[PDB]
Paper text:
The introduction of a methylenecyclohexyl group on the indole NH, compound 7, maintained affinity with both CYP125 and CYP142. Upon inspection of the corresponding CYP125 ligand complex X‐ray crystals structures, it was noted that elaboration from the R1 position (N of the indole) dramatically changes the binding pose of this series. In the cases of compounds 7, 8, 10, and 12 the ligand is observed at a greater distance from the heme, typically with the pyridine coordination mediated via a water molecule, to produce a reverse‐type I interaction similar to what was observed for the inhibitor LP10. R1 position are observed significantly closer to the heme iron, with compound 10 observed at 2.4 Å from the distal water. This is likely attributable to the ability of the additional carbon to facilitate positioning of the ring closer to the plane of the indole, as opposed to compounds 7 and 8 which extend at an angle of 67° from this plane because of the geometric requirements of the single carbon linker.
These sidechain‐modifying reactions are catalysed by the cytochromes P450 CYP125A1 and CYP142A1 (CYP125 and CYP142 hereafter). Here we present a series of compounds based on an ethyl 5‐(pyridin‐4‐yl)‐1H‐indole‐2‐carboxylate pharmacophore which bind strongly to both Mtb cholesterol oxidases CYP125 and CYP142.
Author numbering: 19 to 427
Write the structure that this text describes.
């Protein structure tokens, strides 16, 4: 029924290198909110099961996220697209990080790692991130023009991870280098990167950091993570290393692409940009995340038969939650295609559907976004784009590689 091209794959990186398949996502919400996306032989992005169920409705995304007992993140990982020829064991490597664990293993890890995302712990970063956000902005304005991504979006998200982990200043340069080589392998601009090499360098440094803190324990997030709680629970040295590797991407290109596409949206909607500069509403962060949806989609795997909204899902089959579609569901949003930074409440799923795996760094991201746009307004309120943004070739990330901008006008 649904009017779609033969051979169409919603995880095809060819599409996302050009555009977002908004019209195609809308077609399914009307004609087939849960639609079997078949994949030709050898074109499964690393999965040889023949296709997956596209999930386009927000309520369906929420049901899958909260029914993590049926819909597993471990079985096949949550990334729904790699290079088609990727070895299976390269996919299973994901299972070493919390994102791709099921309960009970995931439950133990999440509980320990929560010590580093308490509201207090994130608040201690406000002043330092505000200071840097202002300086980044001032630095870019002085340049007159350049790559908005590298000059505005790139650094601060990484400074949040470093500050959260108490990484020494002199170490941050190489730490950022490694973190930025973790994803984007499919884009021709980054074909030469080896995410496996830089990850090993990341774990080696993180494990090194963990054994030093045990011998010289101070008050910071790293020490609380490697010390036994009242329950005797804590992160082993390697578990802390897989924690760092997870942050290096989970809080890197996600927050970055939200800053970029957030500024892109402000350029598209001058009314909203004048409004922001005057009142600086912090509800803008959630609207920027909904508008940007930096993670286009994560997948799950059904461990048993499951009926979801009148559609039979069979054990072993993959379901791909398309957050880019759920965040523009006409059923839950009044004018989903209206950029409204005052939108309140705003139940977007850019941080995922509520449930076990809901982004632990959601509020840190919100604060990063708010601090940097306040700085953009303070230091370059009349910036205008020079050329169209350059999109990233990815099957699940909605990335912006470059964006030329004039900060003077
Ligand atoms: C705009 C910024 C961000 C977006 C769009 C985003 C998106 C997401 C999504 C969709 C998930 C999976 C949710 C699910 O499976 O139900 C997730 C999980 C996660 N995020 Fe984020 N995230 C952002 C920022 C951050 C930051 C700044 C950090 C840390 C510094 C972070 C750390 C994590 C971690 C550790 C997980 C795994 C949680 C688990 O598996 O239990 N994220 N994020
Ligand atoms: C020992 C584990 O370390 C890794 O190898 C690794 C972890 C990881 C996590 C994310 C990630 C993505 C999104 N949201 C949060 C996290 C993306 C890529 C990742 N990789 C590299 C990649 C190399 C080979 C194929 C899969 C893994």
């Amino acid at each position: 029924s649904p009017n779609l091209p033969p051979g169409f794959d919603f995880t095809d990186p060819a599409i996302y290198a050009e555009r977002l398949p908004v019209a195609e996502f809308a077609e399914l919400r009307s004609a087939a909110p849960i639609w079997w996306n078949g994949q030709d032989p050898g074109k499964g992005g690393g999965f040889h099961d023949g296709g997956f169920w596209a999930i386009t409705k927000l309520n369906d995304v929420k049901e899958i996220s909260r029914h993590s007992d049926v819909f597993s993140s471990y079985e096949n990982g949550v990334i729904p697209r790699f290079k088609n020829d990727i070895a299976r064991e390269d996919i299973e490597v994901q299972r070493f990080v919390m994102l791709n664990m099921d309960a009970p293993h995931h439950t133990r890890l999440r509980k320990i790692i929560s010590r580093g995302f308490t509201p207090r712990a994130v608040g201690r970063l406000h002043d330092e991130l505000q200071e840097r956000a202002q300086a980044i902005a001032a630095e870019a304005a002085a340049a007159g023009s350049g790559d908005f991504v590298e000059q505005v979006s790139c650094e601060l998200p990484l400074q949040a991870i470093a500050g959260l982990l108490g990484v020494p200043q002199e170490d941050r340069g190489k730490l950022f280098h490694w973190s930025n080589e973790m994803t984007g392998n499919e884009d021709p601009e980054y074909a030469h990167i080896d995410p496996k090499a830089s990850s090993a360098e990341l774990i080696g440094y993180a494990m090194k950091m963990a054994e030093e803190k045990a011998k010289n324990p101070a008050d910071d997030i790293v020490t609380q993570l490697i010390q036994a709680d009242i329950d005797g629970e804590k992160l082993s040295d390697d578990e802390f290393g897989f924690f760092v590797v997870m942050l290096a991407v989970a809080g890197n290109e996600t927050t970055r692409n939200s800053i970029t596409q957030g500024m892109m949206a402000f350029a598209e909607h001058p009314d909203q940009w004048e409004l922001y500069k005057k009142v600086r509403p912090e509800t803008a962060a959630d609207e920027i995340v909904r508008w940007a949806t930096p993670v286009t989609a994560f997948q799950r795997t059904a461990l048993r038969d499951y009926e979801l909204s009148g559609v039979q899902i069979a054990a072993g089959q993959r379901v791909v939650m398309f957050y880019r579609s759920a965040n523009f569901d006409e059923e839950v949003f009044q004018d989903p295609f209206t950029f409204n930074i005052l939108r309140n409440p705003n139940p977007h799923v850019g941080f995922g559907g509520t449930g076990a795996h809901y982004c632990i760094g959601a509020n840190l991201a919100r604060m990063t976004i708010n601090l940097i746009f306040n700085a953009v307004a303070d230091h370059m309120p009349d910036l205008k784009p020079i050329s169209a943004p350059e999109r990233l070739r990815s099957g699940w990330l909605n990335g912006i590689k470059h964006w030329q901008v004039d900060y003077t006008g």
